[PDB]
Design a protein around this nucleic acid. Structure first.
Lengths: 129, 150, 25, 139, 98, 80, 90
RNA sequence: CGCUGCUGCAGUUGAAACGCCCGUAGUUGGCCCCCCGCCGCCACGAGGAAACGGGAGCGCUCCAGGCAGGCCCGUUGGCCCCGCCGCGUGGGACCGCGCAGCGGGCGCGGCGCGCCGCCGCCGCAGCCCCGAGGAGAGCGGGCGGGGGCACCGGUACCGGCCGGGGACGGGUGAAACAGGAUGAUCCCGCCGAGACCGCCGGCCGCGCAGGCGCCUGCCAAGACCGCCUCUGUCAAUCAAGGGCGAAGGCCGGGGGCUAGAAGGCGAUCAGACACCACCGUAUUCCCGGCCGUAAACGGUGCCGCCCCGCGGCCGGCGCGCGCGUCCCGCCGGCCGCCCAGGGAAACCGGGAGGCUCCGGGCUCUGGGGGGAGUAUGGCCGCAAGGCUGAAACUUGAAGGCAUU
């Protein structure tokens, strides 16, 4: 069945970018999908996204700018200790300078840099580089 | 796909976006309720009440014209079926296959389609007792199923 | 069919080994 | 495929424990059949009295007569076949004169053209074989 | 490796087909893996066809045609040249020759 | 072609499956058929399968089919 | 409470009479002592008075039947023939 | 040594997807309510031996060391690590779960409440997310060698019988062994027996696989499609457990036309107890069971998502249009080619794509080649055998795909 809503969404975005499609549709819309995409929109990797209401799970029309290279999810979401974040960034992301790891925190869903500044860690939702 | 077969069909009914009564609607919510009660007294299964209200009457979705789904309206008036319609229809199918097998011992295919039907009955019944819908003691037995139908 | 003939030879020899154990025990 | 559920640690731990055995090396390290089978029985080397000096043929394509001694290990009364290394070294080893034998270096496998000799003599009558060859100590 | 995608037989949506006997070799081959060539030859030889018609007393008589379906196994077909070993590219060509 | 997924083409949508459209919706409509006997029109469902009876007549006026219902006697579709 | 694992009512014959005879008898003697449904009073009371003779305990009807089964398989086939052939004439 | 793979292995062909299906334990489950309690979770504290391992500072001549030292913080010897699955505090995104009506007055209850009782008491919007291109149930419509049972037709094969006619038939690659004036072969009529269902018959279809084609009924199904019908997560995958499973085999009944393991013959050959001819038993067929296996293959588990064009067929449905078994869609299935992409390549491309840029869930299997599927123990079967399954010991390759 559809265990991971976010994995299918980031796969359907990466496939669209490889084709070179500007806009794509995600069949199920979650609050955590919107938060992951919002982070990519505040990092410039995505463009405007609009959640249509079908009165069920809802759809998302996503605009793209070719900027995103890879978007994925870590499953199961493993809680990351604060001092473990850097070890994850040395394998998951290329370069300590670029990339983003999106982790759900008690404060809220945040990038690894934001979590490092607040000195707190949390379960990893996914990653976008 | 299908739980008991490798079939991938997607046929479904897609209810309308707007939860509005129809513009041609002249049936008050109480008026529709009377119709639901009337058909149930005649023994119409809950699914068939909706089809009659869709076709002879103009109620495409009873929930929109009234304030609730058909079984909830039936439950209030106390005329709801004791065993849910979905479980009841499955029990009837098992009774039909078991009756046909008492004249067809060599029918392995109908026995296979009896295992599938009775696995489905146990799984739906297990849900209905956990859902407090059915008495906790309710356990389907192949031998006594036929009398229980009435 | 050497591999099938090999399993035919093996079965024949295990049958014989069973007969010898049946003569004893 | 592998199982990736936050609560499936038990399965992964069981799968690793079960499939660890397929490698010959893990079995030859933990099963313990090797420890009982080995005439050295896990010792670095063993001591034992010479019983027979035997000329063992080399495996093809090599054609030669490797020189070896059959040794009954004092520790477990188990006769092994041990190559005596270097040239003319066999002359130093007499019969029944006691030899210290170590393995060849393939961890219990026969090495080189020599077949079935998993051991080689290192000390004859308390005198190192290599010393008797370099003529550092006499026999 | 796998020489042919069809696996040498036309079995699709099927786990078992009927068994046909190669006419020359009398072997059992599945229906999908069989040569199946249908031939309509006239009952008589074409050398003796006109003289049969002249001899025939019946006016407007038409020489009977013989309708038969010759099915053979791969061994009992390659040796009779009904099918020929083809080049790897030529093997792919599914169109009947001529 | 500047058409976007957010604003889908109106007549193109009806060529897609009802579930696969951007908003899931009914492909069925309620028609206002006119029964030959009564001047008053009768609301009917397009894909009706159950017997439907024209008011004032004892004959089923709907011939059930695989998809959209066919109408037995003379009727005026007057879709509404 | 499962007194014997394989032999059923054949435990009466102990170790004598062989295995093949005791297996056949298990099936034969289960049928002989079985209660069959009365063709007349539709109650499972029919029992075997004698070979070929079966009496309903409740119905009180005595019926001609197979030696160890109320109905033999040949006989059921014969009944179906006669019914079809009689219907063919009429 | 990503040759044990949590990171991070492989299973079309190299080692390896269980023959199939149901199914419990287990693991895994869409979306949804900000603000509440419990959980895990992350942060930070307490409190619990040092040594060790770090690590501040100090020149044992350096150094491994040591805790020294120098007129010096009250000179020092700080500080961390005791995974601590417990506890305290904060957060509350994620992660699971939450069944009751509340509120007022009596009421300050027997030092203030709270339970409990008590009145409708008149305050309260009092109470239902929804209806997944989840799943089940229904209705309608067609669909197909899907299944059981009964019925029945047709040749062919073989045996019998009447006639006719006359000498060789069979069989092969060439022969030969049988067959024949007791009239063979051949022709025709007729009859009996059992099997089997041609051509149509397929890049047709159905079924869970194994598999499935005479006629005429009878009985129960199933997928798919259509749908403004019902339910409301009932789901996914699955140890154990249940059912099914070609052929051959086995055990009882039958039945016995053909073919035909065995056996016997005639050839062949150097030999031939092989291939080929000939005869023929078990078997083949039915009923009630066992067995439990196949190159049970797509050598490719299952459920889910996206992905590139181009055609064919099958089933259902919708749209135009004169109007045609048109056309253009849609959905499900079976397929062919193939853009990327992948791969050691063959090839896959409805994946073997989206993967050293590696994480959707679940089960199973493999870890150099033998020894060896052997031994032994267990379980199962009447047996044959099935299933589970070594080690000692041996060896340096075995294997895949491609080029010449």
């Amino acid at each position: 069945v559809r265990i991971n809503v976010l994995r299918d969404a980031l796969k359907s975005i990466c496939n669209a970018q490889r084709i070179g499609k500007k806009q794509v549709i995600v069949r199920p819309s979650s609050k955590v999908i919107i938060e992951f995409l919002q982070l990519m929109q505040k990092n410039g990797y995505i463009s405007d996204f609009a959640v249509v209401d079908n009165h069920r799970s809802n759809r998302i029309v996503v605009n793209l700018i070719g900027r995103l290279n890879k978007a994925g999810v870590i499953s199961p979401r493993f809680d990351i200790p604060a001092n473990d974040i850097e070890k994850w960034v040395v394998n998951l992301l290329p370069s300590r300078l670029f990339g983003h790891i999106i982790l759900t925190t008690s404060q809220g869903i945040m990038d690894h840099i934001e979590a490092q500044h607040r000195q707190i860690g949390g379960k990893v939702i996914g990653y976008f580089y | 796909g299908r739980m008991h077969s490798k079939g991938k069909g997607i046929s479904r009914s897609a209810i309308p976006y707007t939860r509005a009564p129809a513009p041609w609607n002249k049936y008050t919510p109480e008026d529709v309720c009377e119709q639901i009660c009337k058909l149930a007294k005649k023994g119409t299964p809950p699914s068939r009440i909706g089809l009659i209200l869709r076709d002879q009457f103009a109620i495409g979705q009873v929930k929109n014209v009234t304030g609730s789904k058909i079984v909830r309206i039936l439950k209030a008036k106390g005329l709801a079926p004791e065993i849910p319609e979905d479980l009841y229809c499955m029990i009837k199918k098992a009774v039909a296959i078991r009756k046909h097998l008492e004249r067809s011992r060599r029918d392995k295919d109908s026995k296979f389609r009896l295992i599938l039907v009775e696995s489905r009955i146990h799984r739906l019944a297990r849900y209905y007792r956990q859902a407090r819908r059915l008495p906790p003691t309710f356990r389907y037995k192949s031998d006594q199923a036929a009398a229980l139908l009435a | 069919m050497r591999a099938k003939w090999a399993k035919k030879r093996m079965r024949k020899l295990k049958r014989k080994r069973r007969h010898m154990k049946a003569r004893s025990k | 495929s592998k199982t990736s559920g936050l609560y499936t640690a038990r399965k992964l731990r069981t799968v690793r424990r079960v499939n660890r055995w397929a490698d010959k090396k893990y079995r030859k390290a933990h099963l313990g059949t090797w420890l009982k089978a080995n005439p050295l029985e896990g010792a670095c080397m063993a001591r034992g009295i010479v019983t027979q000096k035997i000329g063992i043929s080399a495996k093809q394509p090599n054609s030669a007569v490797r020189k070896a001694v059959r040794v009954q290990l004092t520790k477990n009364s188990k006769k092994i076949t041990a190559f005596v290394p270097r040239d003319g070294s066999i002359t130093y080893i007499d019969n029944n004169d006691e030899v210290l034998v170590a393995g060849f270096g393939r961890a219990g496998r026969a090495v080189g053209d020599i077949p079935g000799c998993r051991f080689k003599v290192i000390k004859v009558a308390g005198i190192g074989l290599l010393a008797l060859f370099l003529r550092k100590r006499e026999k | 490796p796998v020489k042919r995608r069809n696996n040498g037989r036309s079995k699709y949506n099927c786990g078992h087909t009927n068994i046909v006997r190669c006419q020359n070799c009398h072997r059992c081959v599945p229906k999908d893996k069989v040569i199946k060539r249908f031939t309509i030859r006239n009952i008589v030889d074409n050398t003796i066809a006109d003289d049969v018609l002249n001899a025939c007393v019946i006016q407007g008589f038409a020489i009977p045609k013989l309708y038969n379906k010759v099915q053979y196994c791969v061994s009992c077909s390659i040796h009779n040249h009904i099918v020929r070993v083809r080049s790897r590219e030529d093997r792919k060509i599914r169109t009947p020759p001529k | 072609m500047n058409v976007d997924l957010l604003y889908p083409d109106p007549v193109e949508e009806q060529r897609k499956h009802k579930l696969k459209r951007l908003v899931q919706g009914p492909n069925s409509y309620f028609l206002e058929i006119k029964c030959a006997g009564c001047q008053d029109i009768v609301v009917v469902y397009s894909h009706a399968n159950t017997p439907v009876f024209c008011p004032g007549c004892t004959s089923q006026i709907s011939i059930p089919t695989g998809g959209k219902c066919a109408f037995t006697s003379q009727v005026e579709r007057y879709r509404q | 409470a499962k007194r014997t694992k394989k032999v059923g009512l054949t435990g009466k014959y102990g170790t004598r009479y062989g295995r093949a005879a005791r297996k056949q008898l298990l099936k034969i003697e289960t049928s002989q002592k079985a209660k069959y449904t009365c063709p007349f009073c539709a109650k499972d009371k029919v029992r075997r008075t004698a070979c070929g003779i079966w009496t309903c305990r409740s119905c009180s009807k005595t019926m001609a039947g197979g030696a160890y089964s109320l109905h033999t398989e040949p006989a059921n086939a014969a009944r179906a023939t006669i019914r079809r052939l009689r219907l063919a004439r009429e």
